[PDB]
Amino acid sequence: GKRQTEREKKKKILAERRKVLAIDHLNEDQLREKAKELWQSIYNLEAEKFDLQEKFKQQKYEINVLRNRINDNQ
Amino acid sequence: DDIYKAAVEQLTEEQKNEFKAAFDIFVLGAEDGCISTKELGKVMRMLGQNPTPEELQEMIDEVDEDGSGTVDFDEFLVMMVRCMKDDSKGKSEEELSDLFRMFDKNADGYIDLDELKMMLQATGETITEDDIEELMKDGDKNNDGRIDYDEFLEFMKGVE
Amino acid sequence: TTALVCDNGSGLVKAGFAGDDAPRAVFPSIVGRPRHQGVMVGMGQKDSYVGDEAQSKRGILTLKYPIEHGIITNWDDMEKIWHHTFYNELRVAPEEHPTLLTEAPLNPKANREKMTQIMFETFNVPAMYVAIQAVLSLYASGRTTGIVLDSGDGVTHNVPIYEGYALPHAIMRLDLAGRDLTDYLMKILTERGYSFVTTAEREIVRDIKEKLCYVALDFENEMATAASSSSLEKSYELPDGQVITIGNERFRCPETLFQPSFIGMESAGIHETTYNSIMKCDIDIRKDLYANNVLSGGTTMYPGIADRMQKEITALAPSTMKIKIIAPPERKYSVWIGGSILASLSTFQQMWISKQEYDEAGPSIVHRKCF
Amino acid sequence: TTALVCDNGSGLVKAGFAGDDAPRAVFPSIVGRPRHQGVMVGMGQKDSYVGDEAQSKRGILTLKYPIEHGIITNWDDMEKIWHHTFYNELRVAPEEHPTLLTEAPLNPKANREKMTQIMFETFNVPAMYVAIQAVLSLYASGRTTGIVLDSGDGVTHNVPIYEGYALPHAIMRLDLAGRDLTDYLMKILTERGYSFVTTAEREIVRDIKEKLCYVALDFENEMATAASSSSLEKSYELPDGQVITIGNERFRCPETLFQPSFIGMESAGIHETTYNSIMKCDIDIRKDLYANNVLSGGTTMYPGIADRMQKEITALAPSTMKIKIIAPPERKYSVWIGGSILASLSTFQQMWISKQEYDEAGPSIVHRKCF
Amino acid sequence: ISASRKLQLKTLMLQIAKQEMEREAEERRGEKGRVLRTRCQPLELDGLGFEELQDLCRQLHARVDKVDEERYDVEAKVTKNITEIADLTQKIYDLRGKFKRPTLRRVRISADAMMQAL
Ligand SMILES: Nc1ncnc2c1ncn2[C@@H]1O[C@H](COP(=O)(O)OP(=O)(O)O)[C@@H](O)[C@H]1O
Ligand SMILES: Nc1ncnc2c1ncn2[C@@H]1O[C@H](COP(=O)(O)OP(=O)(O)O)[C@@H](O)[C@H]1O
Ligand SMILES: [Mg+2]
Ligand SMILES: [Mg+2]
């Protein structure tokens, strides 16, 4: 396996399994609402990405704490 | 200073039962409630409560210093309730770790005396004999030149 | 930023930032799943211990190397090893660091292409470059000519170089290396009564080989001496007591290098494949190659090999040429030191395989101009 | 709700709610029907006195243990014992409490399946789980490795464990235990004139064994000393007077543990089956097992056994390893304390055999994933 | 050394810690809002013709695919990092407090005063 399944999953998520959307094919109010949906989805997901960045920060802090404890104890 | 004393002011009947049992063991009526600290520790260990000799020795070194053996009721009840463990889980471990990483800005895997003392002065509390060097003496068990979150627990565990 | 000089190797993964003297983290490349059942609950038992962690719990694991002979036979395990190396032994995310892997000569293409594809897709490095393991060992010696014999643990290869121009028709790659010596030692120890079978006990036999074995200057005289006196028998304490005494197994294990007929291999020893590699070169650069023979790799650390090899080559070579064998004390990490030097060069800074180039030509970019 | 940590054992049933320090009710597991006729009318004479009640009326009963060697030979009596344990010694209906029985290693399957079928059909518990009696004793010591010798009253078994991974091929179960020592003591007491025959007098001999016997540090020296001086003769008062004097029967009764040839058993003592159990383990975890040898079970409470066993193993083992024998003062209830700890864990809360699972797969569910 | 001020000190520390945590949460929220606004510009919906919305939604969809790739990347990263962090937390626990989980006890309670009732 090595990871070919994992990369296949990655590609499917980024290209296929994403919310693959045909957008510019709708009536004026319909296209407007779909654009609003896309914009809101981007907003919420970007908030989530910031949360992931903050979690990366917390995990880094925990790693530093664990490393200092290990070095002190071993 | 205030917690156990106020609880004495608002005494509950649950602790009141043990208070009266110990008093009748000591005071048979129409007395000043002297209750010598030596006898206080002996009976506290005797009455099936927590047999911790450390609190008894602290009280003996602390009370009956007048040479009379009499113990004021306020301090008697305070030491009775404090021999029993009065704490609510010492908050949450992960919560306290987050509190301390907010406190600890260096983030070198530990925290030094400087951040701890800055937070201490941010708390806004008076300074007494157990300040200044009691924290240094207590936290420096292996004397690593720092007081980490684990060392901060080692100093004053069960923070409420 | 700084470059990551990783060096997969086969037996010890050596890594570290470019521009230092020694690799930052050196640890065996083994991934061992537990094999027993496990009854304690909540002990926090993982499903695979990699690196140096599995050399401490090896009593209940089944260690298996992911690299057999230079080539990589188990890609998932190799990916796990790389992930461990990046995240736990160096603690630097690969998204912000170029990498410089190393590869043995004459290896299958698919191995190299898969390596670059992994590095670009999974770890998502900015740029990676693959270099032949012998040119680096020549860098570390500070030379620019010479024929380098890099007897690793997986495969022994012998790349001659002159004035910076490698001679591709004179590379002699032989698959006898440290692992086969470990297996042969484990096989001849049975002649005294000590039986090592488990894949965990192969590590114990490897430790015996490292600490006790040495290369004899003259084989027959040593065989005669060890059969009469007892001045050679050195004892060694197993991980549980019951000391063992190694007799003439001491210099018979590494003698396989100069007589590969011991383990049934047909080819000639490392003393004669170097001379053959020289004789394939042109007639005018043979003196320089004779004078600048370089040793590298772990397995060339046996006490007394730099004299046996010189004696053998002097026997083979013409009497007029001077035979000199360069054996630096930092032999084991010679390849990695050379890798650090190469990655620290300014002239080399534009040879990396940039990610946009890979996106345009696919993994087959490595065989192209960016070698 | 809280879990019921029952522990059937063989000789003493120990039970109590999970999360405490000591079992709530400990009482012998004997069921004795009356044997004489009975002339008083209306005395309220029952047909079977179980538990600690039959240790007070034992003068007119015929006590018979329902568990011979770990296995259960008389299911009706065992059901009666369980019913008594639940309703009268704990006074908690089983309809509202999970149960955690314990079972010796290498026991017949049918015993375990019948046990779970009874617990689910008759008492109708919400969920029950069966655990090996040695892993719990390892829990109680707060370790995670070590080889535990759990010499109960029915059967002595020796389960080695490393890093939480039990080694199923190294379990050495031996059927010599406290009951055979009681019978042998009752058999050697006849050499002075005291004859105990009735099944009620076996209890008196058991009391003699508990209060007087001790394990000799060196057997031959003690045999020589007791045959010359009289400093060992300790006296004991029977339940009716007529004191008796035990001479060298004191250390000859528990010596059977280290020389099972006394009662005609072929196998080697508990001092050598531990070493054999260690030697079956892998070569890299033998040091840890040597250093963390754990004792448990009732029969390991003889005064002076933790020194005799250490001396014997040090004689057998290689001279370099350190031999340490963990003998906590709370040896008798070690298995139950470990059971309480295991039942109190959050990670373990989803391993119970839920009743709906039993309804779908029958009693053979116990051998399945829910072990 | 007085046992008097332990309660006041710990309560004051708790108050300071809660204030710091809520302040950090609020500033994180403000930073996240600013970063979102500078990463995803607010939608413009004033007097746009049909083609204006067509083009804007096309640009938004291209950005949607781009950010979907970015966030699936950071999501896989956070999944791997969280898994590894939990594993190392468990490793540190079994390294240090594994000898203490058995010590988690509520003992010496009922049997202390249940002796002479027999
Ligand atoms: N001091 C030593 N003496 C003898 N043999 C050694 C010594 N150190 C390492 N080796 C052998 O060399 C091997 C390590 O070789 P190494 O250079 O790490 O291989 P690679 O080229 O894959 O990095 C080990 O397997 C061991 O058998
Ligand atoms: N203090 C003691 N000294 C010597 N032997 C004892 C002592 N206490 C119990 N025993 C022996 O151990 C047996 C009880 O063992 P126990 O651990 O209760 O078995 P189980 O594993 O079935 O619970 C008794 O039959 C008795 O022979
Ligand atoms: Mg190499
Ligand atoms: Mg038992």
XYZ file of C-alpha atoms in Angstrom, chain E residues 3-4 11 52-53 81 90-91 94 99 114:
11
model
C -2.406 28.291 56.056
C -4.737 31.300 55.893
C -9.165 31.555 44.046
C -22.024 40.516 -12.965
C -23.342 37.773 -10.695
C -1.360 15.892 14.268
C -0.982 8.301 26.059
C 2.718 7.424 25.856
C 1.903 5.273 30.534
C 1.909 3.501 38.112
C -17.844 -2.455 60.354
